[PDB]
Design a protein around this ligand. Structure first.
Ligand SMILES: *[C@@H]1O[C@H](CO)[C@@H](O)[C@H](O)[C@H]1NC(C)=O
Ligand SMILES: *[C@@H]1O[C@H](CO)[C@@H](O)[C@H](O)[C@H]1NC(C)=O
Ligand SMILES: *[C@@H]1O[C@H](CO)[C@@H](O)[C@H](O)[C@H]1NC(C)=O
Ligand SMILES: *[C@@H]1O[C@H](CO)[C@@H](O)[C@H](O)[C@H]1NC(C)=O
Lengths: 173, 452, 454
């Protein structure tokens, strides 16, 4: 199960960073990470992208922990392509796992599909995510996501749709 | 004797140390692989040192190997220190170590899980030592007679270890021999501990510094002696490595470090009839080792007295029995005084350090004799790489031993420095000490005449 | 007297030598003989590692039994003496007719893969424990539709897999099993009858001691894992009471010191108590059972979108490539393997000590009184190295205040003892301390070592 060629994954043309900012939900996850269709998908979490004056994104993962609403913050620096990104806080140490975030296709209104890669010294991993503005997207987008994931070689079982919980990702609790 | 030479060399080198050393090396090696590497390196360095000593013997043919060489070389105060340290340190401590080994092997079956009482160990060691010194004093006939049965017991123990090791490597899966869990197992290697590992491994190789010249009788010693030295020591090293792998196959390395008698536990794990074979055979081996050490120490006392450094009180053979009773009594007293250490392996370090401290000195003397006073007829010559590499290793050993365990080694150095002044008193007296010393000596001689 | 003195001294020397021999024999007979070692079954040594969901444990790995052999090197690094593979047998949710306990699920692998895995584990000295819970994909582990058929198929599967070579089994969620103790006794005695080195673990969610004791009444040689210590309590006195109550009610029989059934420590415990509870579980008298990921303190709520029941094992920062930067370096196996002070390193050290020390393996356990908030006890064998563990479950720095005279004099407390390791930094290992005035930091655990008195 090798990493796909970067050329094969599409890119979003005329990528407008201003529109992409906001709170995306995760409505599908494809990748050889350990999750399978048969088992528990998990609890849906949200990713908040805030655009900065230097065009770098501030990314906040919010999810529901044991009892605390849990948050985590990172920063994406724009890559070579307008729609590509890389994890910020780069250091010369080879131990760091370079990241190759890449937006595959989005209408900026209700859905998006993005591709992540985590090339590492001893490992090369990738994943695809179906971001959505609402808790649940229409079935057609899920079918398109499954087709695109299968294009990269991921079996059907590797694709997972987290349960749309109504606490922390949306509201308080 | 083209072939018997290898036999005599192997018999002199191979002893009971293999029954006590293996816990010492591994305990400091930290892994089975490092243990076997230490054994191999010690074997090679012993080959080098024996070769240098053979060269020195051919260049300086004189009785008292390792003493005459250090006497004719370095002038005075060097050979006297060799004799002083050999009498005070090396022989009493070798006898004490072998006696403690006998006691540990005798008592291991009775207390397999927990330390036996220290008083029991010391009493059994003293019992063995006193019986052996008595049999040596009474007559040399019995001393040479019992050596056959003791050597037979030692050979039986070694042969059974080797056989039960080769059987188990086929079916025992050799879990620890393979690199799986065979390196960096107990602790990360430390050079300070590796020096102590080499000191304890060298204890297995003994009786080559002085027994490779005093005993050689070859048809063409110049032609054959280098061959014998090069072909007898390596097979001894192979035997030691085979014994170590047999131990590690029979028992886990952790189980080997908490035994105090490696062969007893080996026989327990493998031999169904264990107690009837291993402890008794090793006890015979230790008896033979102590008896041989006693005979050799008395022989050394003979030359020590003849050279005039020692008083005539010693090295006096009894008339009815042709035995050096006064020489044996002093070694017995010194060994009994050494038997209050309570540590089987501390003594090993304490002796090995001194052994190396003088082996290196002798090799340095060889180098000096090469550089200064050359052109001497040397029937067999050695490439100057071997002595210098030996010296390099010797320096490492000493430095790191002092870095790691500066107490036992320090005490040995202090003993040597305490022996240094006596030589001046012997050589030059600013004022003759006729008030006490002479009278004391006379009284001692009189008493020796009266009771012995 | 000139010649008479010679013979007199010679015979006096022989008399003294014989007196020394008699004294040696007397001392040997007076010495205390070593106590026999117990029947140390393979699971009495070291911990057990419950792998649960293999697909989650391997993460980016293959996800099948054939791919599980890659991790056996890591598990050997942990020095766990056993594995509890999740239920691999083929199962249709809530269908007793369509579930078979003798067929491996196609997704998990094939029979040949399982045989190769068992061979490799045996080569590495790891022993597999196949858990045979009939309905592991359903809401209730034991089908409600039928009872007798489920037990019959479990017995048949136990026979078949014992023939295959598994070194034991495990049965979970027994609270839902009807007529549990009888079936447990039957399965346990059949498994022991096949061979002595074969354990049957039992899992319950009950936290009441009386229910556990009733379950153990029929068979006293059954390893039971239950949520008994799961209640955090947050008081050392409470945990001390739980441990002593259980040990003295069960009769000091061998027990499994697992914090739960098929759950991680991080579900019950907060982040700051993981090291303390690891020390306690590794030093208490029994066989600690750890769910996978407990060595790195894996928490299902630490990362977004991670299943609560079966969190994905974090082997490196690329374990989740969908959330860049969320998986910090120091919450992974690779990150914590390079840190001398980390939960994984502490787990490795404690497992090593548990596996090799003859006082922790099989040794008497005696807890004694400390100022309230402290759980302090001693593990000691016969004239062997003794260990003393002092745990500060409170959140306020407390003077240890050890005062233990009720303990046997054979395990008397010396004035000083080494410091084998501390859960928190700030102390020098190997330095003897003053037990009379030993200070303890909040949420700190000290493992001290002292030798046999003589
Ligand atoms: C185990 O005990 C049960 C009790 O119901 C019995 O039926 C079965 O034969 C026993 N099996 C043994 C002792 O192997
Ligand atoms: C534990 O098992 C009992 C028995 O079926 C059940 O009633 C209960 O809901 C379970 N959960 C807890 C937390 O006790
Ligand atoms: C166990 O300990 C408790 C502590 O309260 C005590 O009441 C009980 O009698 C003890 N039982 C046994 C058998 O030791
Ligand atoms: C190390 O792990 C702890 C978890 O106890 C976490 O709080 C801390 O942030 C981690 N280190 C860094 C640099 O984030």
């Amino acid at each position: 199960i090798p990493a796909p060629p970067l050329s094969k994954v599409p890119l979003q043309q005329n990528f407008q960073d201003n529109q992409f900012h906001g709170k995306w939900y995760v409505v599908g996850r494809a990748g050889n990470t350990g999750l399978r269709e048969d088992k528990d998908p998990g609890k849906m979490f949200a990713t908040i992208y805030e655009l900065k004056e230097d065009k770098s994104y501030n990314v906040t993962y919010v999810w529901s922990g044991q009892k605390k609403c849990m948050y985590s913050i990172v920063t994406f620096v724009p890559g070579s392509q307008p729609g590509e990104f890389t994890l910020g806080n780069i250091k010369s140490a080879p131990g760091r796992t370079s990241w190759l975030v890449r937006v595959v296709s989005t209408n900026y209104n209700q859905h998006a599909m993005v591709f992540f890669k985590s090339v590492t010294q001893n490992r090369e991993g990738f994943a695809i995510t179906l971001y959505g503005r609402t808790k649940e997207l229409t079935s057609e987008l899920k079918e398109n996501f499954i087709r695109f994931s299968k294009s990269l070689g991921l079996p059907e079982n590797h694709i997972v749709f987290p349960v749309p919980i109504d606490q922390c990702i949306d509201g308080s609790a | 004797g083209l072939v018997s030479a290898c036999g005599i060399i192997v018999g002199n080198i191979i002893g009971s140390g293999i029954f006590v050393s293996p816990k010492g090396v591994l305990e400091n090696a930290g892994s089975v692989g490092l243990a076997l590497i230490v054994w191999i390196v010690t074997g090679f360095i012993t080959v080098v040192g024996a070769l240098c000593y053979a060269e020195l013997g051919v260049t300086i043919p004189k009785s008292g190997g390792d003493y005459s060489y250090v006497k004719d070389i370095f002038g005075g105060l060097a050979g006297f220190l060799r004799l002083w340290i050999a009498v005070l340190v090396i022989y009493p401590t070798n006898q004490a170590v072998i006696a403690l080994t006998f006691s540990n092997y005798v008592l291991q079956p009775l207390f397999p899980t927990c330390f036996p009482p220290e008083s029991g160990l010391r009493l059994l060691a003293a019992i063995c030592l006193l019986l052996l010194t008595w049999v040596n004093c009474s007559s040399v006939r019995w001393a040479t007679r019992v050596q056959d049965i003791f050597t037979a017991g030692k050979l039986l123990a070694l042969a059974l270890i080797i056989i039960m090791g080769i059987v188990q490597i086929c079916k025992g899966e050799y879990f620890w021999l393979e690199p799986k869990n065979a390196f960096e197992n107990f602790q990360e290697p430390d050079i300070g501990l590796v020096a102590l590992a080499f000191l304890q491994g060298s204890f297995a190789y003994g009786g080559w510094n002085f027994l490779n010249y005093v005993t050689e009788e070859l048809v063409d010693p110049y032609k054959n002696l280098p061959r014998a030295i090069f072909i007898s020591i390596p097979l001894v090293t192979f035997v030691y490595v085979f014994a170590n792998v047999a131990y590690v196959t029979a028992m886990s390395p952790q189980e080997l470090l908490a035994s105090n008698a490696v062969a007893v536990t080996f026989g327990e794990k493998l031999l169904g009839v264990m107690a009837w074979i291993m402890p008794i055979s090793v006890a015979l081996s230790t008896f033979g080792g102590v008896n041989g050490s006693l005979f050799t120490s008395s022989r050394l006392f003979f030359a020590g007295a003849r050279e005039g450094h020692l008083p005539s009180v010693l090295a006096m053979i009894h008339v009815k029995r042709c035995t050096p009773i006064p020489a044996l009594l002093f070694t017995c007293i010194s060994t009994l005084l050494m038997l209050v250490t309570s540590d089987m392996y501390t003594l090993i370090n304490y002796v090995g350090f001194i052994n190396y401290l003088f082996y290196g000195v002798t090799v340095a003397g060889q180098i000096v004799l090469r550089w200064k006073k050359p052109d001497i007829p040397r029937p067999i010559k050695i490439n100057l790489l071997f002595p210098i590499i030996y010296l390099l290793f010797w320096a490492f050993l000493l430095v790191f031993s002092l870095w790691s365990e500066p107490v036992v080694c320090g005490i040995g150095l202090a003993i040597m420095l305490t022996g240094v002044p006596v030589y001046f008193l012997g050589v030059y007296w600013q004022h003759k000490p006729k008030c006490f010393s002479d009278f004391i000596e006379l009284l001692t001689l009189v008493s020796q005449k009266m009771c012995v | 007297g000139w010649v008479r003195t010679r013979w007199a001294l010679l015979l006096l020397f022989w008399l003294g030598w014989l007196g020394m021999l008699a004294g040696a024999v007397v001392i040997i007979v007076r010495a205390p003989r070593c106590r026999e070692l117990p029947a140390q079954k393979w699971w009495h040594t070291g911990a057990l590692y419950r792998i649960g969901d293999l697909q989650a444990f391997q993460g980016h790995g293959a996800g099948n039994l054939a791919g599980l052999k890659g991790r056996l090197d890591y598990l050997s690094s942990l020095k766990v003496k056993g594995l509890v593979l999740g239920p691999i047998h083929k199962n249709q949710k809530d269908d007793v007719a369509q579930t078979d306990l003798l067929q491996i699920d196609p997704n998990f692998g094939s029979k040949e893969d399982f045989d190769s895995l068992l061979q490799s584990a045996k080569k590495k000295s790891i022993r597999v424990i196949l858990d045979l819970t009939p309905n592991y994909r359903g809401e209730n582990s034991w089908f409600s539709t039928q009872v007798d058929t489920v037990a019959t198929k479990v017995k048949d599967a136990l026979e078949f897999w014992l023939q295959a070579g598994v070194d034991g089994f495990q049965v979970r969620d027994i609270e839902n099993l009807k007529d549990a103790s009888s079936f447990l006794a039957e399965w346990q005695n059949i498994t022991k009858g096949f061979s002595e080195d074969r354990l049957l673990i039992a899992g319950t969610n009950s936290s009441d001691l009386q229910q556990i004791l009733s379950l153990l009444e029929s068979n006293k040689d059954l390893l039971l894992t239950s949520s008994y210590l799961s209640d955090s309590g947050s008081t050392g006195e409470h945990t001390k009471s739980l441990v002593t109550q259980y040990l003295n009610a069960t009769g000091n029989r061998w027990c499994s010191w697992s914090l739960s059934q098929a759950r991680l420590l991080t579900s019950f415990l907060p982040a700051q108590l993981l090291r303390l509870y690891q020390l306690m579980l590794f030093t208490l008298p029994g066989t600690p059972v750890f769910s996978y990921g407990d060595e790195i303190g894996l928490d299902a709520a630490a990362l977004p979108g991670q299943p609560m029941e079966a969190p994905v094992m974090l082997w490196d920062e690329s374990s989740f490539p969908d959330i860049p930067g969320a998986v910090s370096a120091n919450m992974t196996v690779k990150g914590q393997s390079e840190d001398p002070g980390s939960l994984l390193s502490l787990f490795r050290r404690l497992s090593d000590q548990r596996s090799k020390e003859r006082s922790l393996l099989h040794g008497d356990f005696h807890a004694f009184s400390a100022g309230p908030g402290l759980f302090s006890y001693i593990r000691h064998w016969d004239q062997n190295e003794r260990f003393l563990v002092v745990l500060n479950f409170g959140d306020v720095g407390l003077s240890a205040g050890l005062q233990a005279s009720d303990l046997p004099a054979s395990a008397s407390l010396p004035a000083k003892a080494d410091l084998l390791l501390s859960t928190q930094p700030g102390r020098e290992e190997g330095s003897p301390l003053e037990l009379e005035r030993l200070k303890l930091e909040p949420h700190e655990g000290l493992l001290l070592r002292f030798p046999y008195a003589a």
